[PDB]
Structure formats: C-alpha cells, structure tokens
C-alpha cells in the first residue's frame, strides 16, 4: 500500500503526523522520512529523532531520493 518501488516516496506530511531524521544518514537537517518508510534496521547505532509536522512546518518524505541520504536506504514498505 505504501510501497513506492522505483521512485521516491514524496508523501506530504499532514498536521500532527510523525516524521524521522537521522544525524548520520541525512545530508542536512531537512532530510526526513515518514513512518511507513523509516526502517530501524537502517539506523541501528545512529542518532534518530522523531518530530511532528506542525502548522508552521511543511514538506515531504525523502525515502528513495538518493540526494537526501549519505547511505542507501532500505524502505520498510518493501518488507513483507
């Protein structure tokens, strides 16, 4: 359902929705992952922070956009 094989996720966050950042994996502070995409197995000993999309905040999940990540990601939605 949340699978996006061959392309980026690009899910636009809604108010109150959680999002993920990894200090090690993100190219900068703005690189984020939705809950359907964030895979714990990609960030075992990494520094991960969960945030919440506010009224004052907007944008999209970067899962599958290689420009956003220092390391290749393994999308959670791909797992069976």
């Amino acid at each position: 359902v949340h699978k996006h094989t061959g392309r980026n996720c690009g899910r636009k966050f809604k108010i109150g929705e959680p999002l993920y950042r990894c200090h090690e994996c993100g190219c900068d502070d703005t690189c984020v992952l939705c809950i359907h995409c964030f895979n714990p197995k990609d960030h075992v000993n990494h520094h991960v922070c969960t945030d919440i999309c506010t009224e004052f905040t907007s944008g999209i999940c970067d899962c599958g956009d290689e420009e956003a990540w220092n390391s290749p990601l393994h999308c959670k939605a791909e797992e069976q």
């Binding site: 999309c53 905040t57 944008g59 999209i60």
Partner: peptide, 4 residues
C-alpha cells in the same frame, strides 16, 4: 524535505 521538510521546511517552511
């Protein structure tokens, strides 16, 4: 990305 997230911003704004």
């Amino acid at each position: 990305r997230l911003g704004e």
